[PDB]
Structure formats: C-alpha cells, structure tokens
Amino acid sequence: SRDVYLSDLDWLNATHGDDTKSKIVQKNHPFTPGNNNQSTKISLKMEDGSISEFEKGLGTIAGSPSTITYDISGAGVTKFFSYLGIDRSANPINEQYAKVDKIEVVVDGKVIYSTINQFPNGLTYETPAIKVDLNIPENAKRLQLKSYAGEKTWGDEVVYADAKFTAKGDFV
C-alpha cells in the first residue's frame, strides 16, 4: 500500500556494540554523530563512486550481534528495502576499524538474507553501498536487522540507509 521507513516506527529493542551502553541506535543519523546530537546525515559511497546522503535510515554500531527488532504483526509488510554500508563518518584509522563480518535480515527467527554469500570478506570502509530488496513472508510477526562486528566493534558505524517497508496496514 505505501512505503514506511523503519526509522518512522518504534523498535521493540535495539542493541548495539558501543562501549557506552546507554547510547541508543539512531534514527536518520549515523550512530556516533547521532548520539553526539549532531545533524550529520547518514551517507555512503555508492557503486558509481559518488557519496550519497540519505534523509532516512538507522545508525548502529555492529555487535555480537547488534539486533534491531520490529513488531510487524498485522502490518501486511510485503517488502524490505535498504542500502547497507559503513557510514562515511566512521574513521578508518587502519584495517582493524570499520570491519563488519556480515549483516542479516531475520524474519520470525529465520535468516532470509545475509551479506555473507556475496561478501565473504565482510564489509569495510571501501565497500560500496549494498542494495537490498527483499520479499517478506506473508503473516510475519518479527523482523530483525543483525550486524556482526567480528573481532572488535571499532569504527563499525553500520547504517541501514533509506531502510523502509512496503506495508498495507497499521503497525502496532
């Protein structure tokens, strides 16, 4: 029926790998700038080599995993769309920073998408934005966005840029 940005909904919970455990996943901003009350927009390097800034999305720090969970029961979600990448605001000091093992989209406990298959070496600061367009099973109740930091969480500014559902209904 219409597109509904995930950042325009409330999550059930949203964990992240940051050292400051009272920081929170950010709506429409990358994680660290967002928590620092900066206006900085989410931005990624695209396949065509340009940097795109996004109006909407989610910013987290990858964890073991970081898990952002939505109740989509009754909402008639048929599609999930997002770009995935490390936000340009991350500081890629060296190979140890901004290195994410994988990102998964999970629906009612089942992984329906993982970067691991096309991205066997994970994501890093140089990885171009990953375009994800997914069919969502009918009558689904829970959708989770999981990002896996691997060895360390340093610089793992994971953003789900322009993350939105196609949905028929009202959300809980």
Please report, as a single letter, which amino acid is at residue 5.
Y
Answer yes or no whether residue 149 interacts with Ca ion by CB under 5 A. Answer: yes
Say whether residue 150 binds Ca ion (CB under 5 A): yes
- Per CB under 5 A, the list member of 27, 29, 99, 102 interacting with Ca ion is 99
Of 10, 61, 4, nearest to 35 by C-alpha is 61
CB closer to Ca ion out of 76 and 122 = 122
Render 134-155 in DSSP notation, one character per residue: EE--TT--EEEEEEE-TT--TT
- Residue 4 is encoded by which pair of tokens? 């509904």
Q: Is 79 annotated as a binding residue?
A: no
Instruction: Indicate whether 156 belongs to the interface with Ca ion (CB under 5 A).
Output: yes
Q: What angle do CA 128, 161, 59 make, to 5 degrees?
A: 105
Minimum CB distance to Ca ion, residue 126 (Å): 14
| Choices 6-14, 76-84, 109-117, 156-164; region in contact with Ca ion by CB under 5 A | 156-164
Contacts with Ca ion by CB under 5 A lie at 99, 149-150, 156
